[PDB]
Amino acid sequence: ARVKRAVNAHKKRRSILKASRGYRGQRSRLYRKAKEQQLHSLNYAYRDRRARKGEFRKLWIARINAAARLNDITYNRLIQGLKAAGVEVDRKNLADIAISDPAAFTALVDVARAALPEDVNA
Amino acid sequence: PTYAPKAGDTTRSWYVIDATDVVLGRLAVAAANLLRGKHKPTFAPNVDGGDFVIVINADKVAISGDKLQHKMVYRHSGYPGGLHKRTIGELMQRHPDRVVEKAILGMLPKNRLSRQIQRKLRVYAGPEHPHSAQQPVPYELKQVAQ
Amino acid sequence: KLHDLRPARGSKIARTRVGRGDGSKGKTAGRGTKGTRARKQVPVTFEGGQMPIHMRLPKLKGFRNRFRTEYEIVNVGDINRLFPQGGAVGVDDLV
Amino acid sequence: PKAKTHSGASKRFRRTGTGKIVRQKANRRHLLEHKPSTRTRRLDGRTVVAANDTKRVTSLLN
Amino acid sequence: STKTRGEVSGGGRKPYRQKGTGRARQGSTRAPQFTGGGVVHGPKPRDYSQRTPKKMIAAALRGALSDRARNGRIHAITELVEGQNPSTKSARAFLASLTERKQVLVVIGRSDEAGAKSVRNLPGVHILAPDQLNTYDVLRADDVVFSVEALNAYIAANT
Amino acid sequence: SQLKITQVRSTIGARWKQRESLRTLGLRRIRHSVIREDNAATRGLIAVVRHLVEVEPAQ
Amino acid sequence: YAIVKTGGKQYKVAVGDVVKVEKLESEQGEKVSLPVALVVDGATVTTDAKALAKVAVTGEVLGHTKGPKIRIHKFKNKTGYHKRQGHRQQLTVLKVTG
RNA sequence: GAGGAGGGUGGUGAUGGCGUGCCUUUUGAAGAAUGAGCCUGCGAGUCAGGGACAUGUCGCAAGGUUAACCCGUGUGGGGUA
RNA sequence: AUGCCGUGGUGUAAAGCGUGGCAGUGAGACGGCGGGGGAUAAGCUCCGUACGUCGAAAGGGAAACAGCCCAGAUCGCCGGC
RNA sequence: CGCGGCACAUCCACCUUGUGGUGGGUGUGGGUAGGGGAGCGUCCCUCAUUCAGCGAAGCCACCGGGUGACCGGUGGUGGA
């Protein structure tokens, strides 16, 4: 039974080239190039899911650091205070209350100050 | 999600740094942090918050004397040879603001936002800056804590 | 009926079509090299060049007697368990 | 269409009463003068083939 | 059946000498990668029925008939006729009243009265003979309408 | 009487003896503190894998 | 507003605010109580851990939606290795009433 | 429904960071190694043999089994070499 | 010193051995230590090493980076160490 | 590590105490050559049932779904 392998192939072809729209070049157009790019796009998106976990953490850290240094304390000592005080907030919500509430963040900074030991010995 | 960077959401203040006796590295780092806008918590690497920074008295900004005569500023012209070596000594008795501006631009990131940001830094040799139209508030440098 | 007919689960095994995409058995189908085996098949005789185990051992001693009087045996104990009574048997009765 | 038994290896191999193939331990044919008797009662008999020569020998026997 | 190379017409010429063209070394206009060229591993005129055993075949058959008798779907009959002139009127009547199902087997035998001559043209109703009785047909068929001669000689030959 | 052992380093560049020793101690992942009883062979193992484990004697 | 702690992550919600939280064991209707890390009244913030074990955020599980179709297609190189698998993270929607 | 506030998909995407195409072959390729300008159709592990081996499943049972052939028309019944 | 063989005890999940089906592989690279040939050379060549890694392993560090160090990715998270 | 969602292997308490399934505990889930297992989609023949000039296939577009191959819905085209 000679099969005429068109339909079977056009399935995945239309797959790739609908998940490939919006590509500058011969990539939304042609199929093999859309496939080369699909492999690269999905490794990029895979790497960027992890990468973005880490990157948002680094951004939040930059922000908490900026609000801390607005309160004359460094990010290191801020974290060591929010640890020793124990307020189990995390850098994400800590940065949110940093943005919207300078008041709540400065309460947090005074919390951290009140929970620093004495010195650079211990 | 953030709430900090959006349309017309960022604030534009001004700063005057008197580069009176300060050293070049601290000065440039301070101006760069003000210029990018990391002194701000409402920060993002995509947007341009940050303050217009003015650096005055940049004529007398401290460099090691043993560096005013050794550290050189090369700038190649594409043409063979054409490497235009130049120390910061003659470069200072010609354009100290160019020295300072060079250091600052070097401490910024390397992107297009770097350009949009550095268009905010003015630097002048004498004490007299012309951008007094605003209320340029003096920001002086202060190591913090820890 | 026929709309209620299935083999025993255990038979009717999936054929392995090999050169069908690098997800099942992909390119080389099992001969995964550029060697000799990757295009053809080396026999069971050829051993590299050193005399194979069927050339260095000696032909087995002795001949085959053309007139080998081959019989067929029947077990006297199993001729008991063939005939419990018995009394009368004979080659035709065995066959 | 009808499989050939490899002749030369059926004239040298012997399927016993069960699944054993017995080769002939016979570097014992040409020069038996220096060879001590020990090394001939070492080379007089029919040795069950080892594992590392079986899977092929049987396909020579078929 | 399809023409593998060596059956394809022509193509015993190597066009395009090996080197110096810029093309691919081809070897025959009938290479399977060409058009019109041969088929590879193609369908050839196979003749494939499996050689099953006598016991398996007969046992399958009598299992299917066992099913039919287990439901009460076997309908042994004397003759499926009006008696001598093959008429499908009364024969359809007596089958679609004898069966009430859709598919019917009718094991008449090598006698034509109105059996294997008159109940044809009835869809669902296939006619067999007491010895070419088989598995696929008793299964395909819902009712298994016999003819007492067919049934009795069938029993008598199977014992 | 007791030891509370914890892998603190992986076992990639760890030679065979060290890796089988972390099997036979019972250490799967990194922050994975197992407890080891009476110390005659257990201290032998806790010598064979010193860079990989940490011992703070549990009660 | 309180920094509810749920699913190994933490969220910042005041009363009446929807949250895409993890697959809490629940149905629609029946409420559910979630711990906090830090609850705030503007200038009265709560920080002391034993003062927070009392404060319980509570909200009505509803919706039990799914996440979005996260298409994985691992593909190394000349290695010749593809592994395509997707993922709908099961979620739930939440309201906050504390 | 207007200028719209909250909101949702869909174009596009200023801007930031991350990031060295596919294949074959290689100790090693993004490779300045091979091959491909692109799209659509065609192109590669098949089948024959009461074959050899091993195994999964199924008949019957110290048995199993028929080959050619004879009767029949569904591949059914005989056929004991 | 090590390593090797045995036994004795404790621990450990498939690890072992026997017998089959199916393979592949038999161009290895660098790195640590031990040595040969080199010249007290090589990104050299050839060996040893229950040594490692790449091969065939991604992520972090090394500016960039097959072999170096941390670490072995089942998927998701705008969470922590 | 936390929290969710798949998968595999051994193990018990089980249902029918080996087939196959409930609960759990533990371990595990990079991968090339290669090995095993399970599967998607194309087309042809049978049995069962079913949709179709009120609109079949094919095609195109959108909206959905499956862990993957891929699947369904809807509209446009078409006219078996």
PDB file of C-alpha atoms in Angstrom, chain G:
ATOM      1  CA  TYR G   1      -0.891  43.209  54.132  1.00  0.00           C
ATOM      2  CA  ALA G   2       0.800  39.935  54.993  1.00  0.00           C
ATOM      3  CA  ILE G   3       3.592  37.899  53.420  1.00  0.00           C
ATOM      4  CA  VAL G   4       1.782  34.594  53.375  1.00  0.00           C
ATOM      5  CA  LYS G   5       4.141  31.628  53.208  1.00  0.00           C
ATOM      6  CA  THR G   6       2.898  28.831  50.976  1.00  0.00           C
ATOM      7  CA  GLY G   7       4.308  26.168  48.704  1.00  0.00           C
ATOM      8  CA  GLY G   8       7.876  26.791  49.753  1.00  0.00           C
ATOM      9  CA  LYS G   9       7.515  30.309  48.335  1.00  0.00           C
ATOM     10  CA  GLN G  10       6.155  33.474  49.904  1.00  0.00           C
ATOM     11  CA  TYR G  11       3.548  35.903  48.633  1.00  0.00           C
ATOM     12  CA  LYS G  12       2.552  39.431  49.624  1.00  0.00           C
ATOM     13  CA  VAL G  13      -1.211  39.804  49.821  1.00  0.00           C
ATOM     14  CA  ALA G  14      -3.647  41.992  51.732  1.00  0.00           C
ATOM     15  CA  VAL G  15      -7.313  41.058  52.083  1.00  0.00           C
ATOM     16  CA  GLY G  16      -9.150  40.242  48.881  1.00  0.00           C
ATOM     17  CA  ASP G  17      -6.360  39.470  46.461  1.00  0.00           C
ATOM     18  CA  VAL G  18      -6.025  36.513  44.140  1.00  0.00           C
ATOM     19  CA  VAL G  19      -2.852  34.407  44.210  1.00  0.00           C
ATOM     20  CA  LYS G  20      -1.695  31.611  41.900  1.00  0.00           C
ATOM     21  CA  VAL G  21      -0.519  29.294  44.644  1.00  0.00           C
ATOM     22  CA  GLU G  22       0.666  25.691  44.511  1.00  0.00           C
ATOM     23  CA  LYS G  23      -1.573  22.626  44.274  1.00  0.00           C
ATOM     24  CA  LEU G  24      -2.990  22.958  47.747  1.00  0.00           C
ATOM     25  CA  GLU G  25      -5.022  19.934  48.800  1.00  0.00           C
ATOM     26  CA  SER G  26      -8.527  21.365  48.588  1.00  0.00           C
ATOM     27  CA  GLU G  27     -11.711  21.962  46.608  1.00  0.00           C
ATOM     28  CA  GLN G  28     -13.717  25.064  45.805  1.00  0.00           C
ATOM     29  CA  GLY G  29     -15.556  26.716  48.673  1.00  0.00           C
ATOM     30  CA  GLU G  30     -13.890  25.208  51.744  1.00  0.00           C
ATOM     31  CA  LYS G  31     -11.394  27.791  53.018  1.00  0.00           C
ATOM     32  CA  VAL G  32      -7.777  27.133  53.975  1.00  0.00           C
ATOM     33  CA  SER G  33      -5.381  28.759  56.433  1.00  0.00           C
ATOM     34  CA  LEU G  34      -1.833  29.683  55.460  1.00  0.00           C
ATOM     35  CA  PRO G  35       1.035  30.851  57.681  1.00  0.00           C
ATOM     36  CA  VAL G  36       2.727  34.217  57.375  1.00  0.00           C
ATOM     37  CA  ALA G  37       6.259  35.494  57.665  1.00  0.00           C
ATOM     38  CA  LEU G  38       5.537  39.195  58.134  1.00  0.00           C
ATOM     39  CA  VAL G  39       2.220  41.004  58.535  1.00  0.00           C
ATOM     40  CA  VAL G  40       2.016  44.773  58.320  1.00  0.00           C
ATOM     41  CA  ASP G  41      -0.448  47.538  59.220  1.00  0.00           C
ATOM     42  CA  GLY G  42       1.648  50.258  57.596  1.00  0.00           C
ATOM     43  CA  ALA G  43       3.583  51.323  60.695  1.00  0.00           C
ATOM     44  CA  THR G  44       2.740  48.367  62.945  1.00  0.00           C
ATOM     45  CA  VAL G  45       4.632  45.496  61.368  1.00  0.00           C
ATOM     46  CA  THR G  46       4.804  42.067  62.972  1.00  0.00           C
ATOM     47  CA  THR G  47       8.169  40.412  63.067  1.00  0.00           C
ATOM     48  CA  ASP G  48       8.581  38.297  66.192  1.00  0.00           C
ATOM     49  CA  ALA G  49       8.138  34.697  65.098  1.00  0.00           C
ATOM     50  CA  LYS G  50       5.854  33.697  67.950  1.00  0.00           C
ATOM     51  CA  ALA G  51       3.727  36.753  67.222  1.00  0.00           C
ATOM     52  CA  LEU G  52       3.395  35.442  63.653  1.00  0.00           C
ATOM     53  CA  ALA G  53       2.526  31.836  64.473  1.00  0.00           C
ATOM     54  CA  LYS G  54      -0.698  33.350  65.799  1.00  0.00           C
ATOM     55  CA  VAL G  55      -1.462  35.479  62.737  1.00  0.00           C
ATOM     56  CA  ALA G  56      -3.008  33.109  60.184  1.00  0.00           C
ATOM     57  CA  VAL G  57      -3.912  34.251  56.691  1.00  0.00           C
ATOM     58  CA  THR G  58      -7.007  32.494  55.399  1.00  0.00           C
ATOM     59  CA  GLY G  59      -8.576  32.253  51.970  1.00  0.00           C
ATOM     60  CA  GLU G  60     -10.933  30.263  49.788  1.00  0.00           C
ATOM     61  CA  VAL G  61      -9.278  27.796  47.441  1.00  0.00           C
ATOM     62  CA  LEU G  62     -10.981  28.093  44.086  1.00  0.00           C
ATOM     63  CA  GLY G  63     -10.382  27.324  40.442  1.00  0.00           C
ATOM     64  CA  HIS G  64      -7.571  24.756  40.600  1.00  0.00           C
ATOM     65  CA  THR G  65      -6.220  25.980  37.287  1.00  0.00           C
ATOM     66  CA  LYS G  66      -3.158  24.692  35.464  1.00  0.00           C
ATOM     67  CA  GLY G  67       0.022  26.468  34.559  1.00  0.00           C
ATOM     68  CA  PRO G  68       1.035  27.150  30.965  1.00  0.00           C
ATOM     69  CA  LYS G  69       2.367  24.545  28.569  1.00  0.00           C
ATOM     70  CA  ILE G  70       6.103  24.592  29.257  1.00  0.00           C
ATOM     71  CA  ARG G  71       7.601  22.919  26.203  1.00  0.00           C
ATOM     72  CA  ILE G  72      10.902  21.186  26.860  1.00  0.00           C
ATOM     73  CA  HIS G  73      12.941  20.028  23.859  1.00  0.00           C
ATOM     74  CA  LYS G  74      16.382  19.034  25.051  1.00  0.00           C
ATOM     75  CA  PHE G  75      18.875  18.773  22.220  1.00  0.00           C
ATOM     76  CA  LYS G  76      22.628  18.651  22.743  1.00  0.00           C
ATOM     77  CA  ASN G  77      24.582  18.564  19.472  1.00  0.00           C
ATOM     78  CA  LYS G  78      26.208  16.194  16.954  1.00  0.00           C
ATOM     79  CA  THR G  79      25.601  13.811  19.844  1.00  0.00           C
ATOM     80  CA  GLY G  80      22.270  13.358  18.095  1.00  0.00           C
ATOM     81  CA  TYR G  81      19.999  13.449  21.113  1.00  0.00           C
ATOM     82  CA  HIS G  82      16.518  14.957  21.350  1.00  0.00           C
ATOM     83  CA  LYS G  83      14.177  14.611  24.309  1.00  0.00           C
ATOM     84  CA  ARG G  84      10.905  16.486  23.963  1.00  0.00           C
ATOM     85  CA  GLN G  85       8.568  16.596  26.938  1.00  0.00           C
ATOM     86  CA  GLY G  86       6.117  19.214  28.183  1.00  0.00           C
ATOM     87  CA  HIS G  87       4.614  20.299  31.478  1.00  0.00           C
ATOM     88  CA  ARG G  88       1.431  21.867  32.850  1.00  0.00           C
ATOM     89  CA  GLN G  89       2.127  22.866  36.426  1.00  0.00           C
ATOM     90  CA  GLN G  90      -1.002  22.275  38.460  1.00  0.00           C
ATOM     91  CA  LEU G  91      -1.984  25.341  40.426  1.00  0.00           C
ATOM     92  CA  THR G  92      -4.861  26.843  42.326  1.00  0.00           C
ATOM     93  CA  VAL G  93      -6.303  30.308  42.576  1.00  0.00           C
ATOM     94  CA  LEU G  94      -6.643  31.879  45.981  1.00  0.00           C
ATOM     95  CA  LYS G  95      -8.410  34.743  47.689  1.00  0.00           C
ATOM     96  CA  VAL G  96      -7.162  36.329  50.897  1.00  0.00           C
ATOM     97  CA  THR G  97      -9.486  37.098  53.797  1.00  0.00           C
ATOM     98  CA  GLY G  98      -7.302  38.024  56.776  1.00  0.00           C
TER      99      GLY G  98
END
